[model samples]
Target chain A: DSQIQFTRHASDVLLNLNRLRSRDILTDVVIVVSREQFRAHKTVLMACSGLFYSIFTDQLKRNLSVINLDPEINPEGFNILLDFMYTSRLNLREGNIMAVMATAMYLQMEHVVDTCRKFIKAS
Target chain B: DSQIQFTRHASDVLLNLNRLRSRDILTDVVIVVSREQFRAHKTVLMACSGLFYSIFTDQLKRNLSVINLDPEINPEGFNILLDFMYTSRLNLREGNIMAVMATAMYLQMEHVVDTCRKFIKAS
Candidate 1:
């Protein structure tokens, strides 16, 4: 029982995920925030965030076609969060750091919250 | 516009995908092949394989809860393929190499097929 690591698979998988997300291909879930809609896949979201995992797990027997985060999460920050979930690239700035931090806190993404803190402290 | 790459994000994403998949959490699609069912995420399959990308893209307007690959694919190899899609690790051996090769070819995973070829040549 010999096993070999597919060294390139990790990056490729992310790349593909990003491409599909950008093109809205096979995206089954839509997140509505700030009057904007974000098309994405539930599997990726559940795999990336604790809150999403719990939400989807609870809704497993039902179809989760749309999720609304209107008042709680700012759409600009949530947009960034969704991009990071797919691309692993976080764009932090003075204008959006607080927004992202708030979103991270609401979503219970510890690392993202930490990243936001580190970014703010360094700035 | 400062952007930082989440270095460990790639591995973490794969790990999470594997964990949720093993427990059947939020798995939206099932692959029925060789009289056995393999639970998985359609988002993952579309991201990892060209054939799946096309199939899902074409069927975007429909619900694809179950996909039948009973005759075209061997369960053993597809099981390994699905695992690799989520884990980024390929388990190859003398007994399973050919089956994997066929599966890779059917899925249009060029790198996987190439890896199988290299393994066969080396063996």
Candidate 2:
């Protein structure tokens, strides 16, 4: 049995998953932060963050849907990171290393944090 | 405000998602085909298939995880397609177009079906 890999397949799949997230279609988890709520798929979150990976694995029951994120987390930063997780893109405004860095650290997304530093140095 | 995209992020995310599936970690969907069941995340299936996307968005209730696939589908075919969905790779032994084609047709995966046709035509 010979194997072949598709280049566009993975990119297309991630695009579709992000689209489904928009209308709350097939979303399995809800993140509540500072009274604001974001609906998402645990599978997506688990893939992107150490925190969600640990939480959804043996750390927490698998069936739980609603998650209360740290209230101290800046919702704007959290939103940016969540968008990056879904789309693999980040929007860093003002060259300020503000809440985006903190949220990346909190999420244990070291890649994101490193990217933030690069953005700072470049700007 | 400026934006930056990560080239490696989507590929890494897909890779990790497949790894999580290996552990059956945070998987929310179970598919049963001809009494041989497979565990997966609906998000992955929904992203890769028209049938799954339709069934998940408006047809079935959101919380239900287990699914009984049409028993007529060859489990081996289904298995190959499922792995492709997760990893963007396919193993067509002797260019096993017969089984893969049928399962792709069942899933309404036009891309996969098209690829199968390409393999057949080339072989």
Candidate 3:
């Protein structure tokens, strides 16, 4: 087993990614949600979701700039999912629990799905 | 104990930060070295070095755009240090070990300093 230490360093890395958003750097891929552009780093998207991993790493590299997310996935829920992927904090509430879960399930992000499931069960 | 798991997700976060450099998003601070501007995220700088944390978070927030690094620290080595901070891997060899160690020590990055010491000893 390859055990690695997660220190404040990793947290800082995530913080910087969020901060860099306004600067508009390194977001080679654009996530299209509800006809809006949500710029993202390919690495984070791929790492968080196997769907993205296959799309990005596989032969479908035609439209490198924009990735059109499913219209069924609410933009707000998708944003929350992206937030969870970056920070590992699932900010859930009654308003967005279902939408977030739908997006999480659609993305096949097992961790987020499990977190959403736990939150739903608790609620 | 706040034991955090250093998962592939964390590595992806670092990878995103490095990727953001090329796209130029969310880099609120710039590191001025050898008259060249290396854009950076403030959180990464602060997390990697207390010196940066003090400088950025303390009263000296006047020029938020650029941070002037010590001229003595070679730009190439600074790049290496930035790489190490983002990805925990010290790419050291005969060519830039001394320069890297000098910058790492100046920045008070003890982990990096220790790694450099071990590499030097082994060499």
Better of 1 and 3 by TM-score: 1
**Model 1 misplacement above 4 A:** A60-62, A70-72, B60-62, B70-72
> In model 3, which regions exceed 4 Å deviation?
A1-6, B1-83, B86-100, B103-123
Candidate 2: where is the Cα deviation over 4 Å?
Answer: A59-61, B59-62
- Writing each residue's lDDT as its tens digit, candidate 2 over A1-123 gives 247888888788889889989978878788998968999988889889998877888654667889998889878899999999998889887644678988999999989989888877987
The positional error of residue B112 in candidate 2, measured at the CA in angstroms, is 0.9
On residues A1-123, what C-alpha lDDT tens digit does candidate 3 reach at each position? 131233556666676666655445445678888867788767667657867866866545723788888887788888877876766666688888899888888888887777777877988
Q: Which candidate has the top score in TM-score?
A: 2
Greater DockQ among 1 and 2 belongs to: 2
Candidate 1: tens digits of C-alpha lDDT, residues A18-77: 888887777778888877888987878877887777788785533779988747678989
The candidate that wins on DockQ is 2
Model 3 C-alpha lDDT per residue in residues B22-101, reported as the tens digit of each score? 65544567888886778876666765775775676564572478778888778888887887776666668788899988
Candidate 1 chain A weakest lDDT stretch, 10 residues: A54-63
> Clashing residue pairs in candidate 2, if any?
none
TM-score of chain A of each: 0.90, 0.90, 0.87
| DockQ of the candidate models in sequence | 0.67, 0.74, 0.13
* Candidate 2 or 1, higher lDDT: 2
After TM-score superposition, the amount by which residue B4's alpha carbon in candidate 1 deviates from its true location, in angstroms, is 0.6
